[PDB]
Amino acid sequence: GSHMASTEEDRFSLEALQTIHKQMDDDKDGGIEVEESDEFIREDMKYKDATNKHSHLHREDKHITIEDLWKRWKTSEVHNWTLEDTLQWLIEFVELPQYEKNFRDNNVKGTTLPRIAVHEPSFMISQLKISDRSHRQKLQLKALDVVLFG
């Protein structure tokens, strides 16, 4: 295809970011318009945050470009989280201490957070005994959360 997934890392990271960017910047015009962003926040993020998500990030920096997400999260703690950070955030904000050991030990460190996949296969799923609903939903929405909130 024209769009060609080069490496699995970009498939996870670039495509995750491309997908969320497309969901907010529908036109991917290179600027997530705060009003565009609002629509994706209104449900997917709504499970946690609705107006504050944009008020914190898009407080000024509204129009976020596809590349901007990359640098944004690159310069955000989410991507810098190690195995201890990731898991502490998991039980603290996810409340799933029954799988923290699996993730941590299988070696999860700020990885599956920007490497979850909404439509494609995720990363955490391989690193958990079962690619079950609770696992995917917990991390998909919470990773979506930490990525898009930063």
**Interface residues with Ca ion (CB under 5 A)?**
25, 27, 29, 33, 36
Distance CA 119, CA 122 (A): 8
State yes or no: 29 annotated in a binding site.
Answer: yes
The smaller minimum CB distance to Ca ion, of residues 33 and 49, is found at: 33
Nearest distance, CB of residue 43 and Ca ion, angstroms: 18
Q: Is 25 annotated as a binding residue?
A: yes
132 is in an annotated binding site: no
Cβ atoms 133, 139 nearer than 8 A = no
State which residue, 27 or 120, has the beta carbon closest to Ca ion.
Answer: 27
Nearer to Ca ion, 34 or 147 (CB): 34
> 25 or 100, CB closer to Ca ion?
25
d(CA 145, CA 150): 8
Q: Give 64: exposed, middle or buried? Use CB within 10 Å, 0-12, 13-18, 19+.
A: buried
| Minimum separation from the CB atom of position 25 to Ca ion (A) | 4
Placement of tokens 């699996």 in the chain: 102
Annotated binding residue at 26?
no
Encoded tokens for 131: 């690619």
* First and final C-alpha spacing in the chain: 32
Numbered residues of the known binding site for Ca(2+) = 25, 27, 29, 36
Numbered residues of the known binding site = 25, 27, 29, 36
